[PDB]
């Protein structure tokens, strides 16, 4: 639970967070339901934090009848939408509730039809990045982002990565099906080791930048 | 006065909805738009000419 270890010095910062302050865009949204979704929607994802929401509909009216009342601009996003919407990002907005019984117990969730902060673009945020292929990946300051959709086929999708799970690949190296976010930078360098569909080793949390 | 040309009521309509709050996401913003109605003036006129004889 507590500090098992010492390092020679404090990480960067957690996933979801932003490390650098300057002109940054986000929107709220609510959660909606990958059931909810209709077509087959494949990509199944526990609403992390550190993921790629899409765009599914809009939750403006209010009421069920003909006199509808359009209380607020309110977006209603997917974990894996092909219409990029924002990276979920700033825990503290959010409120833990536990894990199974376990009031206290770790939490990145955010539960179905909940309301978060979804990152447009950002000066500086930390995400969690994956690996799109099986061969250990060294990223640089020159790296693009792309993010895993709700509908990446099965053939695409052989290591089983999660819905909304942001890639990280290389200039015309992007895993099929996947989804790019335009204008997404990843700013610090990192190296991914060899992974396997089993295995699947989470890379390590990368500042980025967006648009 | 009979002499001008227009009669003039000014109407502005507001705007702005809400949006749920985050720390982080933008402002949401209300503003207004004004319109001016404008009623013209119509004079009619009638007259008479009257003869000694008649």
């Known amino acids: ?211 | 006065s009979w002499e001008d040309q227009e009669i003039v009521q000014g109407i502005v309509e507001p705007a702005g909805t809400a949006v749920e709050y985050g720390d982080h996401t933008n402002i949401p913003l209300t503003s207004w738009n004004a319109n001016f109605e404008r009623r013209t003036i119509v004079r009619g006129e009638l007259g008479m000419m009257v003869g000694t004889l008649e």
């Open chain 1, 1 to 211: 639970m507590f500090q098992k270890q010492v390092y020679r010095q404090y990480t960067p910062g957690f996933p979801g967070d932003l490390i650098e302050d300057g002109p940054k865009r986000a929107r709220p949204g609510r959660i909606m339901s990958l059931s909810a979704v209709n077509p087959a929607a494949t990509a199944t994802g526990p609403n992390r934090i550190s993921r790629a929401f899409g765009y599914a509909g809009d939750v403006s009216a209010l009421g069920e009848g003909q006199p509808k009342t359009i209380a607020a601009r309110a977006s209603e996003v997917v974990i894996g939408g092909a219409n990029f919407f924002g990276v979920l990002g700033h825990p503290k907005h959010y409120a833990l509730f536990g894990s199974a019984g376990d009031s206290l117990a770790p939490s990145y969730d955010l539960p179905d039809g909940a309301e978060g902060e979804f990152f447009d673009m950002a000066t500086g945020l930390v995400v969690e990045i994956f690996n799109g292929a099986a061969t250990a990946l060294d990223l640089d300051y020159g790296d693009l982002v792309a993010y895993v959709p709700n509908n990446l086929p099965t053939a695409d999708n052989a290591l089983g990565l999660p819905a909304g799970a942001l890639v990280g690949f290389k200039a015309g190296s992007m895993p099929t099906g996947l989804v790019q976010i335009p204008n997404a930078r990843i700013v610090n360098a990192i190296s991914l080791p060899a992974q396997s569909a089993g295995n699947l080793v989470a890379g390590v949390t990368i500042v980025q930048l967006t648009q």
